[PDB]
Amino acid sequence: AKHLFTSESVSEGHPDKIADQISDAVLDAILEQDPKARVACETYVKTGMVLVGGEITTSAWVDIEEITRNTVREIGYVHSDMGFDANSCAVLSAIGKQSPDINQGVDRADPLEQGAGDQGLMFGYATNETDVLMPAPITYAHRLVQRQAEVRKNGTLPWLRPDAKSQVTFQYDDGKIVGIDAVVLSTQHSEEIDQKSLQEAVMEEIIKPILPAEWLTSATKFFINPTGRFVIGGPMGDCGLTGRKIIVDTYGGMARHGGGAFSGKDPSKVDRSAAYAARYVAKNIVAAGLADRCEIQVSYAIGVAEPTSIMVETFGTEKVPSEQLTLLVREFFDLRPYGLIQMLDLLHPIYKETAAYGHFGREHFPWEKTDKAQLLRDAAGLK
Amino acid sequence: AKHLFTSESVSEGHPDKIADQISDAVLDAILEQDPKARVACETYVKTGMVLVGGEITTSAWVDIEEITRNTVREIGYVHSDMGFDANSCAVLSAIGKQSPDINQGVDRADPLEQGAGDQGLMFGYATNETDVLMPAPITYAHRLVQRQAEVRKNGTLPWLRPDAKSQVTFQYDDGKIVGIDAVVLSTQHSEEIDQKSLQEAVMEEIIKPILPAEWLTSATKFFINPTGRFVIGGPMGDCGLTGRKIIVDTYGGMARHGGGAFSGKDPSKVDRSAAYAARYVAKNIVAAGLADRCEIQVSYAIGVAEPTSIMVETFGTEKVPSEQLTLLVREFFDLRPYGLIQMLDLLHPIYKETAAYGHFGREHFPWEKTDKAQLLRDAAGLK
Amino acid sequence: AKHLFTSESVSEGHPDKIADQISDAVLDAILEQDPKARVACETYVKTGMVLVGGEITTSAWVDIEEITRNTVREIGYVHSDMGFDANSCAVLSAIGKQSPDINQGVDRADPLEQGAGDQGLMFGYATNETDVLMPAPITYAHRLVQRQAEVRKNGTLPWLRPDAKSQVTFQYDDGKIVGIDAVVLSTQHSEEIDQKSLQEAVMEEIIKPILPAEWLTSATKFFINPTGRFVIGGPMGDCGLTGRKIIVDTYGGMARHGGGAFSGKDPSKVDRSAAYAARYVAKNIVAAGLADRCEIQVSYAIGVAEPTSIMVETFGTEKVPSEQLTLLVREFFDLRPYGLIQMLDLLHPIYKETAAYGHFGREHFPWEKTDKAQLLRDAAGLK
Amino acid sequence: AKHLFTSESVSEGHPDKIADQISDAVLDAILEQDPKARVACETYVKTGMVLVGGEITTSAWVDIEEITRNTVREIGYVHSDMGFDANSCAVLSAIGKQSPDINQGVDRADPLEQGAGDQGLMFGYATNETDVLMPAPITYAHRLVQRQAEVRKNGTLPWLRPDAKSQVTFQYDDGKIVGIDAVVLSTQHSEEIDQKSLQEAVMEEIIKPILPAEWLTSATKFFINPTGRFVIGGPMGDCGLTGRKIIVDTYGGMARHGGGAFSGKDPSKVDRSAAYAARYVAKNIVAAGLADRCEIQVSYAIGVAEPTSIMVETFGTEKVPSEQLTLLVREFFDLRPYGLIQMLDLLHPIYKETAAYGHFGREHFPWEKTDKAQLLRDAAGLK
């Protein structure tokens, strides 16, 4: 039953994903020295200023002027003829520090893996459409621009200044992907490149090697780079702030995504840590037999680490009844907040990368390493 | 089978909304001198500062320093131990004024109606779930703390500083409406009101005579601020950020959401303007009997008028098989970008009411009026 | 009786003189549209931000983002490889606007050329050592860098990025300048120029044509460009704010300079307008006979446009007694504040230039046009 | 012959000083972890904001956000209708941390004592004009509103908000000391005190028992705030600015002043450090009988230890003909830059007391101690 869904992934580059980078990048050293830190990181960016604002609390003492500077080096904005160089661009910073004690915090927490957390409604999903478990669109969006960040940096094309937007559409007939409608990839590029050669370059080294031609029709629209030219890119003309690029980070479109800001929270801010657990259970369910597609919802108000809701659903997919799914899950991996810190050893430095390419997708994440998966087949049956 | 859900909200007090309000307020005040300006602003607010940074094209001159200022005025913030006073509140303009022809990022159509925007994805969702064709957990969340305001200006309960977060937690059975499981208010109270004291006048006056009394279980969990001492609130401690609470700005958690910029953009920018129109399509596709819970996707590509993908699920409940109506929409809801503009009488200041309390929700703004409805039933067949 | 005094003039370029430029440059259009405006203009500059802050009040409505941008074009900071380009450098702005009425102002003013002004102690001086009336050092400081801004811009040397510091020393034996000890001129320059050629270039096209060799010894030290190289210049590594480069603007060293911020005040701020009158009388006295060297002091508290003090002194120079000097002066050109606005027609746009090269010195200033000069000889005698 | 003078001052309340205070406070707090850091900061303050922007080299980590904050605390600003509260006051770091070797601008000597700085000019001036060898119009200005503070913390007159401008207006005859002509206080008063009411407790308690009563004419003009309603004061309306009140920071108006950076620089930067030392030379060259009103110039050139010009006028009154003592100084006051450092025991936090109320003025800081004095009299001849 015919559908053609779409998704956008923007690469590190597009100002919102810069922010995400500075944000967590203050967070990583402010964690590496003190993983018990509470930190958030609302970076604003545009034109000449990276404002790294927000509130911290660690033993650690992170330098911000270079953290900020440095990842703007890293993603590659270096002379003005692009649009803000890493190095004559002010970092200002308005980080409110409270002091590092334990007691009157924004909750109070006391036996360790009980009693805790804050307000937000975090969904999870994984599904079998893909080789690893993410909906087919955001994958062949994210991947696409991830070859863009391979094929600038290494020296393959010398010309793709890295603010790249990349959209993709899949002709959803049934359960499977029969077709894939239009690949929209715009990429910023030097004054060197006449468009016909970019129109050519993109399709060799960025697109064709990562779109599986077995789907690729003779209906499928290449829309590479459509508005004239792109030279000035990154904040030079536009404005960009922390992670309101929030769909692209977690199932581009397909995620019931219950209000939630991803990068730059330490892991006691539940909107993030708790929601990774919502992935860890969903995938862990899916590839292990118990259904063709799994989604969870988990939800907390402030305080009660006894979680206010577990809305598991499959949409006509399940192995046992919809109820026994829930049943198994609950007994198997507790999602009280300081609980999920523990399950997958979170506060040690895995962050710069969660900003930029896929917050879950690359098989090296604590939330992504499917493990207590094959331990689900056994209580369903041996499957 | 049965489910629980949750849907948060924040008042005109929560930093993120206060910011968002200001950005819509500059959008708005830019339109009063003319509507045809492209204009996006983004604020960041916290502590002692609001920076209204953005890129504006317009012949309007509006002095942002006033607009920021009496907007924070309209949120009640005066004697500073209420978080930040809107008299000392610093104000920084970083809005880049471009006049009506040399921008980076323009290029266009021939008649008005064939133009094209920048790219992305948008959805909208209806349901006679409750009154309006909102999925009324976000709505009973919202409505509940629509009353925090009513109170402040109406004198009656006096000590409420502006902030309100909230979660309604409904349980749901597979049809229409079962019972409340939990409901919470966090208002930031006066210094003067005793903790237990506050709870009750809340109970017997904010919460109940909003939140619809038929469903009241002997186990409806009632969290009036399990923290209590919400007092240094407002724009302190958590920072502002324009255009972040997108979910509670759009459809409980019940929304399939696109990445994106609801507040702070003129109705060219099809981030917002497609996803307003996708309630014009949704409410209507319910309102005329032909389903009972649509969600139509729209997407667009930059440098194209003809959109790239449009899909109206029907979570069951379709009173026409399917590709019939998805021609009907194609027949009389011109999804071409500038088309929408003219469809939704969108070029007017209208907008500062948006940032507040659902964009679609309230019966006023043209995005929920049942205009094109019986014109479908008699069209998809003649019934 | 031997002395060797020094002075520094920095060119437009050195961050403090940038500021001075942005400052008055907001002031000129905010005057051109409304000369009755009160405006001040504390621009901060460093690295990536020009902050143009301060308070205004006009009918006018000056754009600031381009004013700010534009004079950073003007003095020539254009690609990053210098240190902040005019155009990916944020201008932010925090200009506090009051509204344009007349009554409760920071004084109250009522018949026109009476009753008025504010607190400050403004000295004036002119003397005969120079062709026009300024002490010999600041002249052969200012002039020097003013050939630097001729010999970059025009295309003579293609290489002097314009943040130039220039110091000069005069062997003061008696009343006259018998000698001139050391010309210290550092100038910023491309990676093109090996120093020996700069060491050569400077002495042809910048120094020798403007130091009168008739003084120039074979003792006189050229100190051109001494710390290694200068490439990055202007705010790129240092920080710069409005007119605290305050000696160089008014008799580099030799001015009793009674506390006072020059650029970017409109002319009801007495520290500036009133003090120009302190020049208009001193020069007007000097070249017209009545003494070899004249200095005045004038001084006001807030309010009483009847000026609290007139400390005229010559230091053993006078034609009549020191007293009759005062006597003539008083009868001749009144220095109540709204008085001196009038004498020399000040509020019409002469400002961008008062920041940068000499606040008095170039023979086209209202304060500098000596006129009621020859009308002093007559009441002394016919001399 | 006779003269009038004037000398202003501002308290720890006037914006410019409040800023200056903070910048010296960061300088200071940077020295506590080590003295050898080059460090310059500059603040800008106003309304809701303090940005401590600057360039620091140091191994110290000091968190500016605290230092700015409890400094504005120490200026008394709390309940916001007193101008700006120092709890909501936003704080922005733009201090560029460089570690101990690759800077733009270093290059140096071989022993410590032959090093060189950046360039400029400095003067210092003594007189047993009144007690200390200050020209005590700035001093009776200063001293007078040194008492505004004494009062606030001592409880007695309570309603004084922190701001004080002031002008003493002395008349002078050609020798020692004649009569007061005028004296004014602008304090910013409470909302509560009646205008006439305030004047008198001012009169009979701030002004008199500072300002030395012998000289009290039947015509000493007494301006207690001819404006009266000074109330919205502090850092509002006129902006802050680090390092601007240089005259009232240095020598009435009676100072020959060099351009420059008294507050906010470590004692390398011979802006400040030469002009502290030129009171060590001045006070001393008076203190040992050999003149009664010196002013020695020093200057330096960048890339030279040996200074470029040094001159000790004697406005008459020289008890040694001249070039004799100007060898003596050359003999035992090593004016070579790092020399001074070691001469003036300058590498210590000392400094936040400086920004307040004369740099030289008070008998404590080594810049007014009569160390080398009788060691001259017996040296310039043996008397």
Q: Are residues B97 and C61, on separate chains, in Cβ contact within 8 Å?
A: no
For A358-373, give one letter per residue: b (16+ CB within 10 A) or e: bbbbeeebebbebeeb
Ligand-binding site membership of B163 (annotated) = yes
Size of interface B-D (CB pairs under 8 A): 49
Distance CA C108, CA B158 (A): 41
CATH code for the part of the protein at A1-9+136-232: 3.30.300.10
Q: Which of residues 35-74 of A touch B (CB under 8 A)?
A: 40, 42, 44, 46-47, 49, 51, 53-55
D97 membership: H or E segment, kind and range? strand D90-98
Angle, helices C270-286/C322-332, rounded to nearest 10 degrees: 120
Residue A42 labeled ligand binder: yes
3 state SS of C349: coil
**Whole-number Cα distances in Å, A348 to A37, A109, A266, A267, A378:** 11, 20, 11, 11, 32
Total Cβ atoms within 10 A of residue C73:
13
Residue B382 token pair? 């003649």
Residue C306: both structure tokens together: 């009847």
How remote is the C-alpha of D31 from its chain's centroid? 19
Cross-chain Cβ contact C88/A46 below 8 Å: no
- DSSP, collapsed to helix, strand or coil, labels residue A132 as coil
Q: Which of D61, D66, D92 sits opposite A93 (nearest CB)?
A: D92
Q: Are D97 and A61 an interchain contact pair (Cβ–Cβ within 8 Å)?
A: no
Q: Do B1-9+136-232 and B10-101+233-269 share a fold?
A: yes
Say whether A372 sits in a helix, a strand or coil: coil
Q: Is A357 left (phi over 0), alpha (psi -120 to 50) or beta?
A: alpha
- The string of DSSP codes covering D236-261 is SSS---SS---HHHHSTTT-B--S--
- State chain C's maximal CA–CA distance in angstroms: 64
Give yes or no for a contact between C330 and C281, defined as CB atoms under 8 angstroms apart. no
**A89/C48 CB distance under 8 A:** yes
Name the resolution in angstroms: 3.2
Q: C69, C80, C93: best mutation site toward chain A, by most A Cβ within 10 Å?
A: C80
How many C/D residue pairs have CB atoms within 8 Å? 206
Q: Which residue numbers in chain C precede an interruption (C–N > 2.5 Å)?
A: none
Beta strands at C4-10 and C49-56: parallel, antiparallel or unpaired = unpaired
A85 is in an annotated binding site: no
CA distance C302 to B252: 61
Answer yes or no: are the C-beta atoms of A166 and A143 closer than 8 Å: no
Amino acid at A357: Y
B31 vs B351: CA distance, rounded Å = 10
What technique solved it?
Answer: X-ray
Of A274, A91, C204, D307, the closest CA to residue D296 belongs to D307
Q: B32-38 long-range contacts, Cβ below 8 Å, gap at least 24? A: B32/B60, B32/B62, B32/B349, B33/B58, B33/B59, B33/B60, B33/B61, B33/B62, B34/B58, B34/B59, B34/B60, B35/B347, B35/B348, B35/B349, B36/B347, B37/B266, B38/B266, B38/B268, B38/B269
For residue D23 the two structure tokens come to 């910048």
Element (H, E) at C56: strand C49-56
Give the distance from CA A333 to its chain's centroid. 22
For residue D240 the two structure tokens come to: 């802050």
3-state percent helix, strand, coil for chain B, nearest multiple of 5: 30, 20, 50
Nearest to B267 by CA among B21, B28, B95, B22: B28
d(CA A259, CA C182): 69
Number of alpha carbons in the 13 Å side-chain half-sphere of residue A224: 22
Q: Give yes or no for a contact between A43 and A287, defined as CB atoms under 8 angstroms apart.
A: no
Amino acid at D275: A
Count of all residues that appear for chain C in the document: 383
Neighbours of C209 (CB within 10 A): 13
Amino acid identity of residue B4, one-letter, is L
CA C10 to CA A188: how far, in whole Å?
Answer: 41
Q: Is B88 in contact with D84 (Cβ distance < 8 A)?
A: yes
CB distance B228 to B195 below 8 Å: yes
Q: Fold for domain D10-101+233-269?
A: GMP Synthetase; Chain A, domain 3 (3.30.300)
Q: What is the dihedral of CA D97, D100, D106, D107, to 10 degrees?
A: -170
Which of these, A110, A199, A207, A205, lies nearest to A156 by C-alpha position? A205
* DSSP string over B217-253: -TT-B--B-TT----S-TTSSS---SS---HHHHSTT
Q: Cα separation of D347 and D311, whole Å?
A: 27
Where exactly are the structural domains of chain A?
Answer: 1-9+136-232, 10-101+233-269, 109-135+270-382
* Residues in contact with B227: Cβ distance below 8 Å, sequence separation at least 6, in sequence order: A106, A107, A302, A303, B186
- Do the annotations mark residue C98 as ligand-binding? yes
The amino acid at A205: E
Closest by alpha carbon to C102, among C83, C116, C81, C85? C116
Q: Which residues contact C93 (CB under 8 A, 6 or more apart)?
A: B92, B93, B94, C51, C52, C53, C64, C65, C68
Residue owning tokens 């255009």: B243
Select from C191, C302, C327 the residue whose CB has the most chain D CBs within 10 Å, as the one to mutate to test that interface: C302
A192 by Cβ neighbours in 10 Å (0-12 / 13-18 / 19+) ranks as exposed
Plot region of D151 (φ>0 → left; ψ -120 to 50 → alpha; else → beta) = alpha
Q: Give the whole-angstrom CA distance, residue B86 versus residue B97.
A: 26
Grouping H, G, I as helix, E, B as strand and the rest as coil, residue C376 is helix
Which DSSP helix (H) or strand (E) runs through A328?
Answer: helix A322-332
Which tokens sit at D201? 């407790």
CA pseudo-torsion sign D123, D128, D134, D140: negative
Are residues D19 and D356 in contact, defined by beta-carbon separation less than 8 angstroms? no
Q: How far is CA D110 from CA B22, D116, D298, D305, in A?
A: 59, 11, 23, 12
Judge whether B329 and B310 are in contact, CB under 8 Å: yes
Name every chain D residue with its beta carbon within 8 A of the beta carbon of A93: 92-94
In angstroms, rounded to a whole number, what is the distance separating the alpha carbons of residues A108 and A102?
8
| Residue in B44, B167, B256 nearest the CB of A44 | B44
Q: CA B41, CA B22: separation in Å to the nearest integer?
A: 9
d(CA C143, CA B266): 52
CB < 8 Å to C248, chain D: 259
Compute the distance between CA of residue A42 and CA of residue A289 in angstroms, rounded to an integer.
40
Give B341-378 as a DSSP string: HHHTT-SSS-THHHHHS-SS-SS-SGGG--TTSHHHHT
Burial A35-65 (b: 16+ CB within 10 A, else e): bebbbbbbbbbbbbbbbbbbbbbbebebebb
Q: Checking DSSP bridges between strand B311-314 and strand B294-300, what pairing results, if any? A: antiparallel
Binding-site residue ranges of D for L-methionine:
55, 98, 238, 269
CB contact under 8 A, D92 and A92: yes
Chain C: residue whose CA lies nearest to D107 = C227
Q: Is the domain covering D109-135+270-382 a CATH 3.30.300.10 domain?
A: yes
